[PDB]
């Protein structure tokens, strides 16, 4: 019922190999819908989902201009960050940011986001009030003081409560046949003997959207959290996701074990067992 829009910026310096590369991707929930790469032959914002293709030339012109301007902004930021940390011009560094909005089933704002990381470490973030900043260290305090003096937070608040929510709602309607369609997992349990003494029970969830899912094993009705091998949820390549959970069980005890699956697309949670 709830939904999110998020843009992801990455800038990576590469001394001796040109100017820092700038990439943007945009998501609605777990669906990538737009991309930009300054290393492309002819850099432009490009559609990656069918429902954004109908936006007109004025939309794509604005989106591309923003990304071209951002490419330069992030190069200046990288220069400033190197100085803030007394770093040499010879090293490669990464600046990332992610921003956007979360809305509930009625389309109203739940909260907004805008945060930054330098070389993989949190640097500065807009607080949930959309008015104040949290800085990680004395370098980020320089950024904070600059952004406070220029009232940047007020610009972000206006965007996050206005355009962000309004355009997310537009995208959800234009893409409703996919973005507002939960595809339930197809589930089954497989059995893999390890030795005479033990076998693996593996509980599979395939073909589901969105990626959020809960997969758990119980033994005699008690969760087996410490004994369960849980792989990261992974993309299938057709918009859907996959996941599995496995437990090692003594030979002959398989029927003490149940797999439990929760997902938005399921009419009811599933309980599964090994069915030889």
């Amino acid at each position: 019922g709830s939904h999110s829009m998020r843009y992801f910026h990455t800038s990576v310096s590469r001394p001796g190999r040109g100017e820092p590369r700038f990439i943007t991707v945009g998501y609605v929930d777990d669906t990538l819908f737009v991309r930009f790469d300054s290393d492309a032959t002819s850099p432009a914002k490009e559609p990656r989902a069918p429902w954004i293709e109908q936006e007109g030339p004025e939309y794509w012109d604005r989106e591309t201009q923003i990304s071209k301007t951002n490419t330069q902004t992030y190069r200046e930021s990288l220069r400033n960050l190197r100085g803030y940390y007394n770093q040499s011009e010879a090293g490669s560094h990464t600046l990332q940011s992610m921003y956007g909005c979360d809305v509930g089933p009625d389309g109203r704002l739940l909260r907004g986001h805008n945060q930054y990381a330098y070389d993989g470490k949190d640097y500065i973030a807009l607080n949930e009030d959309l008015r104040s900043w949290t800085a990680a260290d004395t370098a980020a305090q320089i950024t904070q003081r600059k952004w406070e003096a220029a009232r940047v937070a007020e610009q972000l608040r206006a965007y996050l409560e206005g355009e962000c929510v309004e355009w997310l709602r537009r995208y959800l309607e234009n893409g409703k046949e996919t973005l507002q369609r939960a595809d339930p997992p197809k589930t089954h349990v497989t059995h893999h003997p390890i030795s005479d003494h033990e076998a693996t029970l593996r509980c599979w969830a395939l073909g589901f959207y969105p990626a959020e899912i809960t997969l758990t094993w119980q033994r005699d009705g008690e969760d087996q959290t410490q004994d369960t091998e849980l792989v990261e949820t992974r993309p299938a390549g057709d918009r859907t996701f996959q996941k599995w959970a496995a437990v090692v069980v003594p030979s002959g005890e398989e029927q003490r074990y149940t797999c439990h699956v929760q997902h938005e697309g399921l009419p009811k949670p599933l309980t599964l067992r090994w069915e030889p």
Partner: peptide
């Protein structure tokens, strides 16, 4: 739709 006023850090 992107935010158009990303500031320099």
């Amino acid at each position: 739709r992107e935010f158009s006023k990303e500031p320099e850090l």
